[PDB]
Design a protein around this nucleic acid. Structure first.
Ligand SMILES: Nc1ncnc2c1ncn2[C@H]1C[C@H](O)[C@@H](COP(=O)(O)OP(=O)(O)OP(=O)(O)O)O1
Ligand SMILES: [Mg+2]
Ligand SMILES: [Mg+2]
Length: 539
DNA sequence: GACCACGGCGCC
DNA sequence: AAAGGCGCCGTGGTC
């Protein structure tokens, strides 16, 4: 491959080396580009960044985020990772993709640029005549990479001093709990070691082991086990409380304040575009899609995510999105009329679980009801239904005679979905995103049945993901116009930041864009709230 | 220091 | 522990 002096012509493919994976923290070690049988290697990569008009190549978005960090608008364009991921969503890393589609992912920018060029050639050919995947690439994934780059580079503000104070308070409560556990154990041990805990609970104390761990067959110490032991010894309660606190402390309270960026004063996640089997995004480095919210301490942590001075957070959450998608994908009339009319199913379940009027339902009672209706839907055991409801098997089985009894075409839809996955080797979303599920004709029931659950979940979860992504693509230019920002995506929700004076307008526009993204046989409802913090913006 | 598997658990 | 999708923790082990 011919070496030519740096600058490349327009439309060249880029290769780059980062000192580390996170583009907001990374030093740009090298930059190169490829076109027309020439490779161009940058003498000094930061300065060489100014010459490009767009990031075109493997991991295009990551380079674009680093460009934005440096005050440059270098939007991501074609990325062979996105083409390969649409073909087969197990194409998630560039190591894998290079080997599969015609090269080797090295640690050299020039080779990486050449690799991008020839991988795009090959992958663009594989998507010839794959009209619906091409639509997803042009209308969702490629434009979405730009949106996510802005989200990544913008970050979210975090109340740091508040989290530091919270840390010292939770440290004292943890100390209280561990001292009481050690007394009840009759000795101190490492309470964070589940192996040590196993021996204390089941050998030294006499408590009955319920279940076993999956890979190594040890006696389980999980919450589900411990809940069934909640009055068989006073120690179990303390352990459950200790687990809650140390999880939140070790994962959220302590690490997040140390991740504030020195230039932005904000906390920056990565939104991974080729990481799931269904077409959802993921978030990492720090994961901001699992910030807690259920428990009171969880809520305290969520209040730490705050609007910039003079701005408000706007949180928009789709209501019962997968259930509405199912009504559409299947065509079940009784499910369609429930949404056409305007009933609630999470609240319907909660008021019958807890045995209270509907007016007496609240947020945390609906939390319980989400394990039940989703859980039950995607192939839950009658037996486990009994456990989390905490009732007999006779009442848990008859619920899956009622949750299903009314809806003939859901069953027919699952079965149709499974038979097509067996035939074609893949299942698909409403827009034709594929997941290959090979184990549907496996000869071992438990493997076959796990594969089935995965297979009929994907059109549902994947369609909801497609809708949210499309909604993000259309919403983004409208917010830039209003001087507003998109901060986070959490599967079925978005969090925006709007100047105080334009917040209510932003809220109304965003809602309307999300409700009418792609009309279905049933309406999409979005709940919206505005606030100084992430918690209060939903309440 | 790094990587990994595992159990465990946060969110959707 | 009991018939969906993730990423990150501490442990325990390894190199
Ligand atoms: N426990 C779960 N198991 C499987 N899927 C889940 C679970 N919790 C949530 N999801 C999926 C299904 C939801 O439609 C989707 C979005 O989550 P979420 O907002 O919490 O519930 P929801 O959209 O159905 O109700 P709502 O928004 O009205 O409170 O993610
Ligand atoms: Mg939600
Ligand atoms: Mg695991």
């Amino acid at each position: 491959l011919e070496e030519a002096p740096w600058p490349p012509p327009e439309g060249a493919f880029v290769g780059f080396v980062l000192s580390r994976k996170e583009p907001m923290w990374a030093d740009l070690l090298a930059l190169a580009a490829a076109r027309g049988g020439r490779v161009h290697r940058a003498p000094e990569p930061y300065k060489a960044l100014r010459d490009l008009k767009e990031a075109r190549g493997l991991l295009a978005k990551d380079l674009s985020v680093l460009a934005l960090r440096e005050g440059l608008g270098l939007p991501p364009g074609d990325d062979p990772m996105l083409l390969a991921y649409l073909l087969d969503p197990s194409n998630t890393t560039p190591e894998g993709v290079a080997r599969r589609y015609g090269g080797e992912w090295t640690e050299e920018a020039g080779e990486r640029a050449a690799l991008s060029e020839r991988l795009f050639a090959n992958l663009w050919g594989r998507l010839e005549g794959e009209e619906r995947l091409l639509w997803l690439y042009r209308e969702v994934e490629r434009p979405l990479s730009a949106v996510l780059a802005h989200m990544e580079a913008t970050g979210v503000r975090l109340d740091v001093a508040y989290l530091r104070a919270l840390s010292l308070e939770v440290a004292e409560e943890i100390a209280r709990l561990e001292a009481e556990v050690f007394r009840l154990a009759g000795h101190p041990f490492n309470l964070n070691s589940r192996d040590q805990l196993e021996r204390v609970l089941f050998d030294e104390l006499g408590l009955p082991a319920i279940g076993k761990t999956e890979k190594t067959g040890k006696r389980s110490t999980s919450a589900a086990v411990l809940e069934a032991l909640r009055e068989a010894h006073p120690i179990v309660e303390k352990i459950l409380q200790y687990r809650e606190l140390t999880k939140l402390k070790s994962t959220y309270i302590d690490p997040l304040p140390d991740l504030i960026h020195p230039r932005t004063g904000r906390l920056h996640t990565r939104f991974n575009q080729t990481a799931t089997a269904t077409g959802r995004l993921s978030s990492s480095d720090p994961n901001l899609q699992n910030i807690p919210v259920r428990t009171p301490l969880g809520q305290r942590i969520r209040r730490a995510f705050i609007a910039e001075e003079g701005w408000l957070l706007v949180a928009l959450d789709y209501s019962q999105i997968e259930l509405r998608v199912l009504a559409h994908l299947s065509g079940d009339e009784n499910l369609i009329r429930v949404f056409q009319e305007g009933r609630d199913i999470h609240t319907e379940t909660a008021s019958w679980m807890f045995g209270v009027p509907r007016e007496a339902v609240d947020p945390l009672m609906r939390r319980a009801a989400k394990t039940i209706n989703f859980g039950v839907l995607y192939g839950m055991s009658a037996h486990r239904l009994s456990q989390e409801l905490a009732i007999p098997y006779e009442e848990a089985q008859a619920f899956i005679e009622r949750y299903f009894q009314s809806f003939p075409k859901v069953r027919a839809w699952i079965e149709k979905t499974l038979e097509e996955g067996r035939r074609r080797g893949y299942v698909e979303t409403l827009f034709g995103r594929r997941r290959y599920v090979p184990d549907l004709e496996a000869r071992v029931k438990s493997v076959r049945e796990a594969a089935e659950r995965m297979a009929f979940n994907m059109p549902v979860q994947g369609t909801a993901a497609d809708l949210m992504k499309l909604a993000m693509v259309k919403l983004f230019p409208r917010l830039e116009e209003m001087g507003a920002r998109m901060l986070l995506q959490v599967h079925d929700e978005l969090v925006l930041e709007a100047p105080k004076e334009r917040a209510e307008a932003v809220a109304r526009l965003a809602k309307e864009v999300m409700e009418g993204v792609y009309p279905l046989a049933v309406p999409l409802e979005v709940e919206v709230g505005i606030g100084e913090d992430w918690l209060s913006a939903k309440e």
